Motif scaffolding. Structure first.
Motif, PDB file in Angstrom:
ATOM      1  N   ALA B 229       0.822  -1.203   0.000  1.00 22.31           N
ATOM      2  CA  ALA B 229       0.000   0.000   0.000  1.00 22.31           C
ATOM      3  C   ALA B 229       0.858   1.257   0.000  1.00 22.31           C
ATOM      4  O   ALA B 229       0.444   2.285  -0.547  1.00 22.31           O
ATOM      5  CB  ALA B 229      -0.941  -0.005   1.203  1.00 22.31           C
ATOM      6  N   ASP B 232       1.412   2.196  -3.289  1.00 24.29           N
ATOM      7  CA  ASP B 232       0.202   2.834  -3.788  1.00 24.29           C
ATOM      8  C   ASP B 232      -0.055   4.174  -3.110  1.00 24.29           C
ATOM      9  O   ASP B 232      -0.593   5.090  -3.743  1.00 24.29           O
ATOM     10  CB  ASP B 232      -1.001   1.907  -3.600  1.00 24.29           C
ATOM     11  CG  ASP B 232      -0.888   0.632  -4.414  1.00 24.29           C
ATOM     12  OD1 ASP B 232       0.088   0.501  -5.180  1.00 24.29           O
ATOM     13  OD2 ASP B 232      -1.773  -0.239  -4.288  1.00 24.29           O
ATOM     14  N   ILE B 233       0.317   4.308  -1.835  1.00 26.35           N
ATOM     15  CA  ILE B 233       0.170   5.587  -1.147  1.00 26.35           C
ATOM     16  C   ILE B 233       1.096   6.628  -1.763  1.00 26.35           C
ATOM     17  O   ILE B 233       0.679   7.754  -2.062  1.00 26.35           O
ATOM     18  CB  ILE B 233       0.429   5.421   0.362  1.00 26.35           C
ATOM     19  CG1 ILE B 233      -0.787   4.790   1.047  1.00 26.35           C
ATOM     20  CG2 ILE B 233       0.774   6.761   0.999  1.00 26.35           C
ATOM     21  CD1 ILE B 233      -0.616   4.573   2.534  1.00 26.35           C
ATOM     22  N   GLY B 236      -0.243   7.621  -5.155  1.00 26.28           N
ATOM     23  CA  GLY B 236      -1.360   8.548  -5.099  1.00 26.28           C
ATOM     24  C   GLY B 236      -0.936   9.948  -4.701  1.00 26.28           C
ATOM     25  O   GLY B 236      -1.366  10.933  -5.307  1.00 26.28           O
ATOM     26  N   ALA B 525      -7.621   6.400   3.551  1.00 29.30           N
ATOM     27  CA  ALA B 525      -7.973   5.264   2.707  1.00 29.30           C
ATOM     28  C   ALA B 525      -8.759   4.237   3.515  1.00 29.30           C
ATOM     29  O   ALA B 525      -8.255   3.696   4.503  1.00 29.30           O
ATOM     30  CB  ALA B 525      -6.717   4.634   2.115  1.00 29.30           C
ATOM     31  N   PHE B 547      -5.657   3.441   6.237  1.00 29.80           N
ATOM     32  CA  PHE B 547      -4.357   4.076   6.052  1.00 29.80           C
ATOM     33  C   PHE B 547      -4.496   5.565   6.331  1.00 29.80           C
ATOM     34  O   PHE B 547      -5.310   6.241   5.695  1.00 29.80           O
ATOM     35  CB  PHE B 547      -3.822   3.839   4.637  1.00 29.80           C
ATOM     36  CG  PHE B 547      -3.754   2.389   4.253  1.00 29.80           C
ATOM     37  CD1 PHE B 547      -2.680   1.606   4.644  1.00 29.80           C
ATOM     38  CD2 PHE B 547      -4.766   1.807   3.507  1.00 29.80           C
ATOM     39  CE1 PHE B 547      -2.615   0.271   4.295  1.00 29.80           C
ATOM     40  CE2 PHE B 547      -4.706   0.472   3.154  1.00 29.80           C
ATOM     41  CZ  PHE B 547      -3.630  -0.298   3.549  1.00 29.80           C
ATOM     42  N   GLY B 550      -3.646   8.199   3.455  1.00 34.21           N
ATOM     43  CA  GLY B 550      -3.193   7.494   2.267  1.00 34.21           C
ATOM     44  C   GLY B 550      -3.898   7.957   1.008  1.00 34.21           C
ATOM     45  O   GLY B 550      -3.293   8.023  -0.065  1.00 34.21           O
ATOM     46  N   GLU B 552      -7.403   7.840  -1.725  1.00 35.13           N
ATOM     47  CA  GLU B 552      -7.861   6.894  -2.741  1.00 35.13           C
ATOM     48  C   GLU B 552      -8.001   5.488  -2.153  1.00 35.13           C
ATOM     49  O   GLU B 552      -7.181   4.597  -2.378  1.00 35.13           O
ATOM     50  CB  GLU B 552      -6.915   6.899  -3.946  1.00 35.13           C
ATOM     51  CG  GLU B 552      -6.839   8.226  -4.681  1.00 35.13           C
ATOM     52  CD  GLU B 552      -8.067   8.497  -5.529  1.00 35.13           C
ATOM     53  OE1 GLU B 552      -8.819   7.540  -5.813  1.00 35.13           O
ATOM     54  OE2 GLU B 552      -8.282   9.666  -5.911  1.00 35.13           O
ATOM     55  N   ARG B 555      -7.820   2.800  -4.534  1.00 35.54           N
ATOM     56  CA  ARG B 555      -6.498   2.519  -5.076  1.00 35.54           C
ATOM     57  C   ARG B 555      -5.518   1.981  -4.043  1.00 35.54           C
ATOM     58  O   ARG B 555      -4.528   1.349  -4.427  1.00 35.54           O
ATOM     59  CB  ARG B 555      -5.905   3.783  -5.712  1.00 35.54           C
ATOM     60  N   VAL B 556      -5.766   2.209  -2.756  1.00 33.68           N
ATOM     61  CA  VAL B 556      -4.857   1.795  -1.688  1.00 33.68           C
ATOM     62  C   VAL B 556      -5.489   0.723  -0.806  1.00 33.68           C
ATOM     63  O   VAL B 556      -4.933  -0.364  -0.641  1.00 33.68           O
ATOM     64  CB  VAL B 556      -4.396   3.008  -0.850  1.00 33.68           C
ATOM     65  CG1 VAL B 556      -3.480   2.553   0.274  1.00 33.68           C
ATOM     66  CG2 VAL B 556      -3.704   4.030  -1.732  1.00 33.68           C
TER      67      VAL B 556
END
Ligand SMILES: *C(=O)[C@@H](NC(=O)[C@H](N)c1ccccc1)[C@@H]1N[C@@H](C(=O)O)C(C)(C)S1
Lengths: 336, 577
Positions: B229, B232-233, B236, B525, B547, B550, B552, B555-556
């Motif tokens: 993540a 991904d974090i 984003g 997130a 998260f 984070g 999205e 997405r995360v």
């Protein structure tokens, strides 16, 4: 007049004989054996001087001694010396005195002269002895002295148990008091105090009860033939070296001692002599079953010595002076 | 007037008889317990250390334990048989120091027998043994936690300094059950000064072993899924211009909705519980306590903004109160005017007519604007009624220390002064509707089971006593509507691309929370997801990933749940071999 009970004197002499013998190994400091020998000399001379008194003069000073003992129990908390976290001694150099000894010998006389009248068994039976007992225990718990307070309460209980006897109302009263006071002290007890009390019950906590646990193993060393203190643990030193066939000899002499004290208590026809000798034999026997119970690992530790067997600067003299008053009221049991 | 004295004479007679019987017990029945070998040997009493309980999960994998720590200490510097020791130890020399020093800490089980033959019982070479808590399969600290020695304030509570007090989230709850009785023994010591016979005076209780509901398999995947993540974090936050902020702030919870057991709970940035334990004073652990971040706190039980995850409860409170039928009609417009300002939608064009099932699917915000606009002043109080009924306000029943989840009511705003425009923000989760990932995971488990509101418990059994799970039912007249909208989110809503082609038919709802700091594009997130909505032979499972900042959640957080769900049901990847 030579009308005493020599059987009681021989039992005391045989116990204090084994006490000096046992102090030969328990703290073999010759300086301590000197102060113990000169204590027996004054303890026997004081009892010899108390025989130059009449029973009427003895109970004539019941309230004077009780009132004077309350003045010392209130003065010991000001100009006293702290020996072990409590001020309960008067030491002005070569002098050694404890006000708790005068409180016991003063309360037994005062509560006997007072309770010779009618106790209103309805409600105010316990009112009179409680009004005389709480000022004594109250000035002892502010020392603090839990062991000396239990001897006072047990002696007062014995006095009431001979005259009052509210068996149906006394037991129900104790069961209620033994459940309401712990229900109030336990919530207000600190964790330092809560664990301290719990350690007193279950002694298996080494940083404080190691020696007291070692006493249980020290006594069981010899059979058929370092401890904390000699004073509070004379029995452990004596029981360890003399085996089990000896322990029954010390338990026998103390058993015969409390027997003649109660036996001589019955020979006196007067009620105040019945109460005085009962409370004395109650207070004396209470320490024994408590002191020996601590050593054997049964009774919780209270910090009391063995009378007529321990090291006492004045506790030997005060115990002998108490026996002198016992022999006093026995030869005066008939005359008025 | 005489019989009471006869009783006292009999009392002290039987009292001294009991003391004589007590002495006779120690003297005669226990003389074999204090023998002295017919010599002047003294007796030393030592207390026995208490074996702390073993923490293991289900299936028997040990997670916490404690064994010996064998060390080599030598003083003086005598060679003895060092021609064999130097290659065995690999030191090639004996460093001559005055003070006692340790060589080769942590002797393995193979080197110790070889050393013992070379110890020769000499005064210089000896093997000291020590107790330290060992974690064979370490689990995220904020959940698992650490162990320290007895504090000075704890010593006065009857604690020996050698005892181990657990400030852990999990080891504090189990501390009354893990601790054993510190026994006491006595050993006869000869005049020379050696052990002869041991005497057990207090048997040491070896503590109790706790069985957890955690799965070591899912637990590795949970902590693992937190790291991907970050990729991904950072991805984003890159589109927003903010720094990479490589810290992985968040947590994840995976539990069974039926039996109420929790299967995987992990927070980040977690620590290693072996750091505080075995080391006397680990300098790395001192920096963990002074950390500017929160490496020790369990973000699964801490209150945060739930965002679009709370709207699932808003629909529950909307259907049970009778505001909307399961087949109402509301068009998900791009903009809505409450009366003072314009309520913004997550999108920018007209979505079309929706129902309660369609509103949960595409996570339309304009649905919960028109519906609440009917009765905005009375629904807010009734909202917290159903919200606390689902398990969002009260505690979850977890053994680990848990924080208070705040639900806004009209009475709370009076003691905090209320405005009507706050209800719409509260309806989606903006108005300080602080919730925790643990409480969030319970809210979904209630809707997954269709009424049952189970209690979350990490422990499956203490000692050997199976802890029974406590249930509670909530009055729900329309459960299927929420369950359909949750899968409609996976089937047609936000989770279409991740879990649409997924084998196990999953349902859930994504979530982002406009952070109160600056609202600059880095939201919280969120994603919730429960197990098989269809009668597919797969055990039920609920997963919730969170998260901090984070952004999205689709997405995360959504892929983080796909990882844990794949690990639970054994979903194979690109494995054509
Ligand atoms: C929640 O119900 C929806 N909106 C939000 O969470 C936030 N108000 C928001 C963040 C960013 C842009 C617009 C709104 C849904 N939560 C997100 C999600 O499902 O991941 C959404 C933005 C896609 S919509």
């Amino acid at each position: 007049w030579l009308a005493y009970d020599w059987g009681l004197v021989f039992l005391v002499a045989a116990i204090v004989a084994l006490g000096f013998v046992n102090l030969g190994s328990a703290a073999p400091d010759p300086v301590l054996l000197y102060r113990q020998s000169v204590a027996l000399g004054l303890g026997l001379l004081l009892a010899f001087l108390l025989q130059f008194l009449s029973r009427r003069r003895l109970f004539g000073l019941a309230y004077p001694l009780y009132g004077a003992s309350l003045l010392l129990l209130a003065l010991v908390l000001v100009v006293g010396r702290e020996i072990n976290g409590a001020r309960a001694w008067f030491v002005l150099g070569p002098l050694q005195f404890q006000p708790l000894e005068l409180a016991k010998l003063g309360l037994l006389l005062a509560l006997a002269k007072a309770l010779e009248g009618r106790p209103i068994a309805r409600v105010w039976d316990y009112a009179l002895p409680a009004l005389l007992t709480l000022p004594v225990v109250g000035l002892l718990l502010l020392q603090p002295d839990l062991g000396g307070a239990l001897v006072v309460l047990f002696g007062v209980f014995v006095v009431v148990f001979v005259r009052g006897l509210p068996w149906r109302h006394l037991l129900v009263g104790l069961f209620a008091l033994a459940l309401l006071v712990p229900t109030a002290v336990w919530p207000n007890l600190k964790p330092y105090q809560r664990e301290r009390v719990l350690i007193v019950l279950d002694p298996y906590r080494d940083p404080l009860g190691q020696g007291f646990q070692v006493i249980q193993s020290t006594i069981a060393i010899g059979s058929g033939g370092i401890p904390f203190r000699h004073t509070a643990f004379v029995f452990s030193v004596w029981a360890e070296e003399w085996g089990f066939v000896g322990v029954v000899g010390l338990l026998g002499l103390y058993g015969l001692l409390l027997a003649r004290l109660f036996a001589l208590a019955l020979a006196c026809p007067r009620l105040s002599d019945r109460l005085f000798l009962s409370g004395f034999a109650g207070m004396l026997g209470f320490q024994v079953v408590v002191n020996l119970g601590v050593a054997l690992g049964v009774m919780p530790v209270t910090g009391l010595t063995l009378p007529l067997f321990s090291y006492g600067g004045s506790s030997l003299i005060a115990t002998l002076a108490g026996l002198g008053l016992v022999l006093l009221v026995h030869r005066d049991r008939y005359q008025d | 007037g005489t019989g009471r004295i006869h009783a006292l004479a009999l009392f002290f007679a039987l009292a001294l008889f009991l003391l004589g019987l007590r002495a006779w017990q120690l003297q005669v029945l226990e003389y074999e317990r204090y023998a002295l070998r017919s010599q002047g040997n003294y007796l030393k009493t030592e207390d026995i250390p208490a074996p702390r309980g073993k923490i293991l999960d289900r299936k028997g994998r040990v997670l916490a334990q404690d064994r010996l720590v064998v060390d080599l200490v030598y003083t003086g510097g005598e060679v003895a048989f060092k021609e064999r020791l130097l290659p065995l130890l690999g030191l090639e020399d004996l460093p001559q120091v005055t003070e006692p020093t340790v060589l080769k800490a942590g002797v393995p089980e193979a080197l110790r027998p070889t050393l013992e033959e070379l110890t020769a019982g000499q005064k210089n070479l000896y093997l000291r043994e020590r107790i330290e808590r060992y974690y064979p399969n370490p689990i995220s600290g904020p959940v698992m936690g650490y162990v320290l020695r007895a504090n000075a304030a704890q010593v006065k509570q009857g604690y020996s300094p050698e005892e181990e007090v657990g400030q852990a989230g999990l080891e504090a709850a189990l501390e009354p059950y893990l601790r054993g009785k510190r026994g006491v023994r006595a050993v006869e010591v000869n005049v020379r000064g050696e052990r002869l016979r041991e005497t057990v005076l207090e048997e040491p209780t070896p503590g109790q072993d706790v069985v957890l509901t955690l799965d070591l398999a899912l637990q590795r995947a949970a902590e693992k899924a937190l790291e991907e993540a970050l990729a991904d974090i950072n991805a984003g936050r890159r589109l927003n211009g903010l720094p990479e902020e490589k810290q992985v702030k968040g947590a994840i919870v995976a539990l069974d909705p039926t039996t109420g057991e929790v299967l995987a709970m992990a927070s980040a940035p977690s620590f290693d519980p072996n750091l505080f334990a075995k080391r006397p004073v680990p300098e790395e652990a001192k920096a963990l306590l002074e950390d500017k971040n929160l490496p020790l706190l369990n973000r699964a039980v801490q209150p945060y903004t739930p965002g679009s995850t709370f709207k699932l409860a808003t629909s529950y409170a909307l259907l049970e109160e009778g505001y909307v039928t399961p087949a109402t009609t509301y068009r998900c417009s791009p903009y809505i005017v409450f009366g003072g300002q314009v309520r913004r939608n997550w999108a920018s064009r007209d979505m079309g007519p929706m129902t309660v099932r369609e509103a949960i699917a595409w996570s339309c915000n304009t649905w919960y604007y028109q519906a609440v606009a009917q009765d905005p002043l009375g629904f807010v109080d009734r909202l917290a009624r159903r919200a606390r009924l689902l398990g969002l306000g009260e505690a979850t029943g977890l053994e680990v220390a848990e924080k208070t989840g705040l639900l806004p009511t009209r009475a709370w705003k009076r003691e905090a002064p209320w405005y009507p425009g706050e209800t719409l923000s509260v309806a989606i989760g903006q108005g300080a509707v602080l919730a925790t990932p643990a409480q969030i995971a319970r809210m979904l488990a209630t809707i997954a089971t269709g009424g049952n509101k189970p209690a979350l418990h990490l422990v499956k059994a203490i000692g050997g006593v199976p802890v029974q799970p406590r249930w509670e039912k909530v009055p729900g007249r329309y459960w299927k509507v929420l369950q359909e909208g949750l899968r409609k989110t996976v089937s047609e809503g936000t989770a279409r691309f991740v879990l649409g082609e997924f084998p196990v038919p999953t349902g859930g709802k994504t979530g982002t929370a406009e952070t109160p700091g600056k609202r600059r594009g880095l939201e919280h997130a969120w994603y919730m997801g429960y197990g098989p909505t269809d009668g597919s032979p797969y055990p039920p499972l609920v997963v919730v990933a969170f998260f901090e900042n984070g952004g999205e959640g689709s997405r995360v957080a959504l892929p983080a749940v796909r990882k844990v769900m794949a690990a639970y049901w054994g979903i194979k990847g690109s494995l054509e071999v």
